[PDB]
Write a protein that binds this DNA or RNA. Structure first.
Length: 519
DNA sequence: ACGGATTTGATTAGGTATGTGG
């Protein structure tokens, strides 16, 4: 029987059926579909979400990666479950937001990924691709020093352990925001609660949770003020979560905003003044199940969320589930039809970062000159070499020159914003076949961009007869290919191959002529 | 930028009902 091998992007011909293999400490570079390639809400179909994963043993050419050489292309077979496990929260309610969430996770985290060989059909051919079995977070952002330093002089505290004096004391409180009020004065009221009581705290104005029937006691409702010059920064941080400002939260005819379950890490200055506990919000950071937190912060955040959910009147939870989901990990459960609180939190704990820091420095414009969407011109290079499929796979670097290859067409696919063509060696019988080594025997070739697809179909409308699209299946064609590039993250690309002078028409008529010659 | 010596400093019921975009 077989012998050990090192897992590698090109090693799928060696993978055992139903064996699980492990990518340790992988960087997910990017994925497809994404905002650059599929603008609009292209519905993410199972098996058609693809991620690209680098491991740090693999070579680094540039910001253009090459699947099957220095990154894995990995099919996601159950998008719902992949999103749920990795920490994406908006699917299916919002494709756009889901992908944006996935971007934030992969840009900041490293993952242990379990993959396996999965059969897929190429017309009447079959081959193998990498599929994702599981994903476990391996490493996360380290605690920023600004957090470590600021909480050293603003220690974490429950409201009940705030001990005020004549002189200012500084603290960090994790709280539910309760009210926003402005009387046009010098400060803005953003009051908050812990459900934790303090004898110097006293604020009963609009002191309720969700509805008037669930009170917040006055010695739990911390009156707190923001200096006017600091409101706009807080406003813009919340706006990054709920796409609207602080004032706009108090929309129900009073100052209470608990129907939105907005949670902040408050950075506060406390001082007794004139008989009262005066609390000043010097900073506030929205805290979300996706916002990373230290373990110590979570000790306070977790019971906070538990009390909000348990004490919130049921009917308000029902009316505002989606709204509160911004901050509360609420889920819809099934046999019972009851919202439930999940335990879900992101925690704090170079090579690729510095490559895209270079690209952020220099032009995306240079690489964008090889975007697959850019109209494909004809005469870039003279005396193009004729080459095998294995040679093409090994080309690897953007030599920027045209290539010729003679290949059998296994299938052709209209994917809407691209045409995909699958090629194998010309010298095999029929198209019913199983390709055990896709790395050496299977080349996929694509056409992207309005101008290129218009030339391919002969129509600005992508109009075609379907039997003319697939007539070239089984024909052997002399292709000319150019390397082009597909954007998979803001500063990360993958390399692909695009055909030149290839039209539905030429492929169609060639196919008929070739049949007639053989017959 | 960066840090502290960090800007000021009020009421206590009860009505109505989202999500931030298909």
């Amino acid at each position: 029987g077989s012998d050990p091998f090192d897992l590698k992007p090109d090693s799928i011909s060696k993978a055992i059926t139903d064996r699980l293999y492990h990518i340790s400490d992988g960087k997910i570079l990017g994925f497809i579909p994404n905002q650059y390639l599929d603008p609009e809400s292209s519905l993410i179909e199972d098996d058609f979400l693809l991620i690209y994963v680098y491991t740090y043993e693999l070579p680094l050419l540039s910001a253009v990666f090459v699947p099957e050489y220095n990154c894995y292309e990995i099919a996601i077979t159950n998008v719902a479950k992949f999103f749920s496990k990795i920490g994406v929260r908006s699917y299916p309610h919002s494709i756009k937001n889901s992908l944006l969430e996935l971007k934030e996770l992969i840009d900041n985290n490293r993952y242990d990924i379990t993959i396996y060989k999965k059969e897929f059909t190429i017309g009447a051919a079959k081959s193998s691709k990498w599929a994702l079995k599981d994903v476990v977070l391996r490493s996360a952002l380290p605690t920023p020093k600004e957090v470590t330093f600021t909480e050293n002089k603003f220690p974490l505290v429950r409201v009940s352990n705030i001990v005020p004096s004549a002189s200012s004391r500084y603290y960090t409180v994790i709280g539910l925001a309760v009210t926003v009020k402005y009387t046009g004065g010098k400060t803005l009221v953003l009051s908050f609660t812990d459900f934790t009581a303090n004898p110097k705290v006293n604020y009963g104005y609009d002191s309720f949770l969700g509805s008037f029937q669930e009170r917040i006691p006055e010695n739990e409702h911390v009156h707190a003020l923001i200096y006017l010059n600091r409101v706009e920064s807080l406003n813009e941080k919340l706006q990054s979560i709920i796409k609207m400002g602080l004032m706009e939260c108090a929309d129900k005819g009073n100052s209470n905003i608990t129907h939105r379950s907005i949670i902040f890490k408050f950075t506060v200055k406390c001082q007794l003044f004139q008989g009262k506990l005066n609390t000043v919000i010097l900073d506030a950071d929205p805290i979300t199940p996706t916002t990373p937190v230290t373990t110590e912060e979570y000790k306070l955040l977790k019971p906070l969320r538990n009390k909000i959910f348990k004490r919130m009147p049921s009917e308000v939870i029902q009316l505002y589930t989606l709204t509160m989901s911004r901050f509360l990990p609420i889920s819809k459960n099934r046999m019972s039809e009851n919202p439930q609180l999940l335990q879900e939190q992101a925690f704090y704990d170079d090579s690729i970062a510095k490559l895209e820091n270079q690209l952020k420095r220099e032009g995306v414009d240079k690489i964008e000159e090889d975007a697959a969407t850019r109209p494909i011109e004809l005469f870039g290079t003279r005396n193009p070499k004729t080459v095998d499929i294995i040679d093409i796979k090994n080309n690897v670097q953007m030599d920027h020159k045209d290539i010729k290859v003679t290949a059998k067409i296994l299938s052709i696919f209209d994917n809407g914003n691209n045409v995909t063509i699958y090629l194998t060696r010309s010298g095999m019988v029929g198209t019913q076949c199983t390709i055990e080594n896709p790395f050496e025997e299977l080349l996929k070739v694509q056409i992207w961009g309005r101008q290129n697809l218009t030339l391919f179909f002969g129509n600005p409308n992508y109009s075609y007869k379907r039997e003319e699209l697939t007539a070239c299946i089984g024909s052997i064609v002399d292709f000319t290919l150019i390397p082009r590039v597909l954007r998979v993250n803001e500063y990360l690309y993958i390399k692909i191959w695009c055909p030149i002078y290839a039209t539905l028409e030429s492929l169609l008529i060639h196919s008929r002529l070739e049949y007639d010659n053989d017959t």
